[PDB]
Design an enzyme around this catalytic site. Sequence first.
Site, PDB file in Angstrom:
ATOM      1  N   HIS A  63       0.822  -1.208   0.000  1.00 17.21           N
ATOM      2  CA  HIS A  63       0.000   0.000   0.000  1.00 17.21           C
ATOM      3  C   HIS A  63       0.862   1.266   0.000  1.00 17.21           C
ATOM      4  CE1 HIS A  63      -2.614   3.201   1.603  1.00 17.21           C
ATOM      5  NE2 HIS A  63      -3.586   2.554   0.987  1.00 17.21           N
ATOM      6  N   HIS A  64       1.865   1.303   0.877  1.00 13.85           N
ATOM      7  CA  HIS A  64       2.888   2.354   0.843  1.00 13.85           C
ATOM      8  C   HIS A  64       4.221   1.892   1.435  1.00 13.85           C
ATOM      9  CE1 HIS A  64       1.838   3.666   5.072  1.00 13.85           C
ATOM     10  NE2 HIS A  64       3.132   3.930   5.068  1.00 13.85           N
ATOM     11  N   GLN A 126      10.220   1.052   5.862  1.00 15.79           N
ATOM     12  CA  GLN A 126       8.899   0.682   6.367  1.00 15.79           C
ATOM     13  C   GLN A 126       7.989   0.322   5.194  1.00 15.79           C
ATOM     14  OE1 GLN A 126       6.220   3.835   8.163  1.00 15.79           O
ATOM     15  NE2 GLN A 126       6.234   2.443   9.922  1.00 15.79           N
ATOM     16  N   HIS A 128       4.093  -0.897   4.316  1.00 13.65           N
ATOM     17  CA  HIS A 128       2.706  -1.076   4.725  1.00 13.65           C
ATOM     18  C   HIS A 128       2.006  -1.998   3.728  1.00 13.65           C
ATOM     19  CE1 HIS A 128      -1.575   0.807   4.800  1.00 13.65           C
ATOM     20  NE2 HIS A 128      -1.523  -0.169   5.689  1.00 13.65           N
ATOM     21  N   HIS A 198       0.667  14.228   6.710  1.00 14.34           N
ATOM     22  CA  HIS A 198       0.352  13.046   7.507  1.00 14.34           C
ATOM     23  C   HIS A 198      -0.549  13.372   8.696  1.00 14.34           C
ATOM     24  CE1 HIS A 198       0.536   9.158   9.463  1.00 14.34           C
ATOM     25  NE2 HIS A 198       0.999   9.739  10.558  1.00 14.34           N
ATOM     26  N   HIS A 200      -4.013  11.026  10.884  1.00 12.54           N
ATOM     27  CA  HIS A 200      -4.766   9.763  10.939  1.00 12.54           C
ATOM     28  C   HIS A 200      -6.214   9.969  10.432  1.00 12.54           C
ATOM     29  CE1 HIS A 200      -1.597   8.378  14.170  1.00 12.54           C
ATOM     30  NE2 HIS A 200      -1.052   8.656  12.997  1.00 12.54           N
ATOM     31  N   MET A 270      -2.234  12.774  14.489  1.00 13.16           N
ATOM     32  CA  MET A 270      -0.980  13.447  14.189  1.00 13.16           C
ATOM     33  C   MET A 270      -1.289  14.603  13.247  1.00 13.16           C
ATOM     34  SD  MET A 270       1.995  10.476  13.887  1.00 13.16           S
ATOM     35  CE  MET A 270       2.894  10.048  15.387  1.00 13.16           C
TER      36      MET A 270
END
Length: 310
Positions: A63-64, A126, A128, A198, A200, A270
Site C-alpha cells: 500500500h505504501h 517501512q 505497509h 500526515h 490519521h 498526528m
Amino acid sequence: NECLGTIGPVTPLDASDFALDIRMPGVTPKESDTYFCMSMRLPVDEEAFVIDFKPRASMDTVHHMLLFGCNMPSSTGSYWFCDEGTCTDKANILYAWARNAPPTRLPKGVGFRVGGETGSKYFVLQVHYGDISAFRDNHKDCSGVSVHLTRVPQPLIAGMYLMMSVDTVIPPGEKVVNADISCQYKMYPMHVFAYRVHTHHLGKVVSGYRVRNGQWTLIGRQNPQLPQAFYPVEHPVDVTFGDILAARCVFTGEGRTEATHIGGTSSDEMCNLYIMYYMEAKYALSFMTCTKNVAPDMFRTIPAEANIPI
Ligand SMILES: [Cu+2]
Ligand SMILES: [Cu+2]
Ligand code: NI
C-alpha cells in the site's frame, strides 16, 4: 520485486557510484494493515550522497513504503513490526512511495548527504501491506527500494523541514478543531520542491505556507486521506531569514466517543507536514523541525482555502 539471492544488495555502477537494494527479507504478513520494518547499515563509512530512488514494490500487496535515515534503528533484528516506529533517535524521511500516487524524481544536482561523521549510518525501510489476498499462496515478499549512492559531492543538498503538532486535543463530536504550527525561519535560504502530509483518520485538510511581510504564499495543501506521497510544489518557493512558516491541520471529532490527542496509534492523531527542500551545498543543513506556535494571532489572516476540504 524478486528477491536478490546470490548477487546480494550492492551493485557497482561506476568508480564512484553504486546501487543499494533495500528489501524485506522474504516476509509473509498474516493480517491486514501490517507494518514491517527492516534496517541496513551503509556499506561505506565515508560521506556519500543519495541522488536517486527506484521502487521495487508489488502492485498487489504493498500500500505504501517509506525510507528513513538514522543512526539507531529500533531493532537489531531481521525485521520487526513498526506501526509507526523506525528509530530510537531521529528518523529522517528521505522517500515515500504511495500506491495510486507515483513519486516525483529529485531535481538533478540535488542529493541527501549520508554517512561520514554526521550523516545517517543506517537506512530503515517501512512497508505497509494493505490487502493480503495475494498472499494466499503463502509467498515470500521482498518489496523495497533501490538507492543510488555517489561519492561525488552534489552542488545542491536535500533536507527536510518538519512541522508537527504536539498539544492538540480533539473533543468528541466536535465539528471543527484546528491544529496550528508556526516558527520563525533563521537559516540560509531553502527552496521547497516537494511536500507530504500526515494525519490519521480524523484529518480533513493540511496546509503549509510561507508568511513574509504578512503575505501568505502556498507551499502545499492536501487531503491527508489521499495517498500520502511526496507531492511536487506547484511553484518553487524560497524560505529566507525572517520568514514565518505556518501550517494548519483541520480535524473533526465526529464518530468518536472520547477525546483524541496526539499519539502513535490509530486511536490518536498526528498533524505532520514534511517540507522537502534544497539548499546551496556550502550553506546547507539537512533537517529543521517546528513543534511550536510562535505567532498564534497571525492565523486570523490565513487564506480561507486552509479551512475547506480540497
Ligand atoms: Cu499505506
Ligand atoms: Cu501518524
Ligand atoms: Ni528562488
